[PDB]
UniProtKB/Swiss-Prot annotation, chain B:
The keyword Metal-binding applies. SUPFAM superfamilies: Enolase C-terminal domain-like (SSF51604), Enolase N-terminal domain-like (SSF54826). PANTHER family: O-SUCCINYLBENZOATE SYNTHASE, O-SUCCINYLBENZOATE SYNTHASE-RELATED. Substrate binds at R25, S136, K161, V162, K163, N193, K268, C296, M297, M298, D320, L321, D322. Its cofactor is Mg(2+). It comes from Francisella philomiragia subsp. philomiragia (strain ATCC 25017 / CCUG 19701 / FSC 153 / O#319-036). Mg(2+) binds at D191, E219, D244. Part of a large, functionally divergent protein family. Protein modeling and substrate docking was used to predict the substrate specificity, prior to biochemical analysis. Keywords: Isomerase, Magnesium, Metal-binding. This is L-amino acid-D/L-Glu epimerase.
Length: 362, 364
């Protein structure tokens, strides 16, 4: 019977290839916390999670304190086989801070898989090793945005996530330029990041329908708490509506199902607090006939690998996992081949297949 | 025109005189972060907030980073009179961490009042200076619970908040003992901290009504997100039902109003992220005919004073602000007279009057 007898954490900062700009922040790096769990047979497991404070409220400093001072006393000395119960006991001591939970949940899965000498994807039941991602396009003026999209098409992507909601007039004009520059072989996914109101959303959908575009989803058009508007939009729309910030966890999923507020849920492990909770959402969505995609924060390739592993296990094929495009290939080439637009897991990995040598020990 | 030109913080740790135990956690201490904003005319403004990780998710470490690295660049160099714009822009950068936001909102209020040479209570429009609080009673076995209640009664408390929800069988048996021990001049407020399910909550309310107790509220009996059960309990109960963890901010207040999920909201500045957001909740509750009380985390007396100042300005008279009863009197005697059960603001204080720099070393 294996027991967890040590926990360490380490902060990992990864430089980005270009500057990443959100509605509230600009950065040239990814902030992550890694956690290492050590079993009394010597097997070590790792989880890595981002500190995206504007979305999940996590900070590196908060996560470190939580893991060392709050989760560690619950985990330490406990049997690996009781992980479901251990995590439930640990997590009930902390409201929010979902990324700190993610790091812990992922390290546990890495241990479970390593104990069976298999990959985490295999542990979770995956057989396929490859998932398609869109490429993400930052907000910009119409011309810069058309060019960015072109460069994406040229790099082999055919699913294009277009960020909107900063300049509604730009969003509207953009659709005309889209209809003129691209064929229905290009599939568009718009993510307003809560930037539109109800009237704007309806209008944007109307403008789309004035053209001949291939648009597969409209993601989180309005504020995360406006479940009434989301439901009104879902009913109005002839295009799949995706809940992102409206759904972190399973009880959020229950509410959007109950209120019919989306057609599809965007699962991210940084919101769910890891794989166990993401599996609960996927089971609720299936029962409701609601589909799921997977997404991520701007986060390290380790988070992307864990998310891809979950998706492959859950028969989720729609994915927005393009942070691999923002970092150096050498950070992930030990476990992922990114032949755009395909994210392909390497063969015969034990657990996730990354180690934290350069961070923890070198 | 005054500009904010420095932001510094300090951790405060306070021991409790006795163990505070609820359905959610047990503790013998309070961890808080204080923030100090300095104006270019040398005036200093303070806010203090608790790190109650099991309830608001806040940590001292996350609060320090948020305040000094995320909010500070927004706040530094800005004019005091632009406080509303500045806080809105700063707070948009951070999801949750409502206690970090409370500390900053309070320091701004301290400055605003000081710049007018008045108390914060006066700035907010208070006319009264006294509010009555209950004393709250930790979860425990019946005998020790009765003793703790007797203690509170001898200290002159007549409203007693009894923590429940850790042990439902205990909660039911306790009702027999309260009825035996206390008169109806003692008013009971039960707070389950989410620990009951729907069936249990109904059974508890039925049981109360088998006895002859003076019971004022039933607070947050079920999980914070079970708004459907909250509405069912509200419709079922002859006793007012209070949302605490179900309502942190104005949009949470809208939802429980829309769903008829409570009769009263327990406003706490550690949940609302400070006074500005708490005012918005009060306005919505007034418009909906929903009453408000004020509460707190088990937190420093500085948060009690701020919360009492708000309540007095908003004509809120029902209060659970008992942490003063759990800590050394010298932590509050600079600014409050606690003639149990009355919290009385001292006269002629400028701002809140916390007097923190005397005992804490602030750093940027
Ligand atoms: Mg529809
Ligand atoms: Mg999104």
């Amino acid at each position: 019977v294996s027991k967890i007898i040590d926990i360490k954490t380490s902060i990992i900062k990864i430089p980005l290839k270009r500057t990443f700009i959100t509605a509230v922040r600009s950065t040239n790096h990814i902030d992550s916390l890694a956690v290492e769990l050590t079993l009394d047979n010597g097997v070590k497991g790792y989880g890595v999670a981002p500190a995206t404070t504007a979305i999940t409220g996590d900070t590196l400093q908060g996560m470190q304190y939580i893991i060392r001072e709050i989760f560690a006393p619950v985990i330490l000395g406990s049997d690996l086989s009781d992980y479901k119960q251990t995590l439930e006991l640990a997590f009930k001591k902390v409201m929010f801070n979902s990324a700190a939970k993610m790091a812990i949940d992922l390290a546990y899965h890495d241990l479970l898989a390593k104990e069976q000498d298999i990959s985490v994807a295999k542990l979770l039941g995956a057989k396929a090793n490859s998932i398609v991602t869109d490429v993400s396009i930052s907000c910009g003026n119409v011309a810069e945005t058309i060019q960015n999209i072109q460069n994406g098409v040229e790099a082999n992507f055919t699913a294009i996530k277009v960020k909107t909601g900063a300049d509604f007039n730009r969003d509207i004009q953009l659709l005309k330029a889209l209809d003129n520059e691209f064929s229905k072989n290009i599939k568009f996914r718009f993510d307003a990041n809560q930037g539109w109101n109800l009237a704007q959303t309806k209008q944007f959908i109307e403008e789309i329908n004035k053209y001949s575009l291939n648009v597969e989803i409209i993601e989180q058009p309005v504020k995360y708490y406006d479940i009434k508007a989301m439901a009104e939009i879902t009913k109005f729309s002839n295009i799949p509506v995706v809940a992102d910030e409206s759904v972190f966890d399973a009880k959020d999923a229950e509410r959007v199902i109950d209120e019919q507020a989306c057609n599809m849920i965007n699962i991210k492990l940084a919101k769910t607090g890891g794989i166990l909770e993401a599996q609960k959402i996927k089971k609720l969505a299936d029962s409701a006939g609601i589909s799921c995609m997977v997404g991520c924060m701007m986060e390290s390739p380790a988070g992307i690998l864990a998310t891809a592993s979950f998706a492959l296990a859950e028969d989720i094929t729609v994915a927005d996992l393009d942070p691999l495009d923002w970092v150096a290939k050498d950070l992930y080439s030990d476990y992922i081949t990114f032949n755009e637009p395909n994210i392909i897991l390497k063969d015969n990995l034990k657990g996730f297949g990354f180690n934290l040598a350069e961070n923890l020990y070198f």
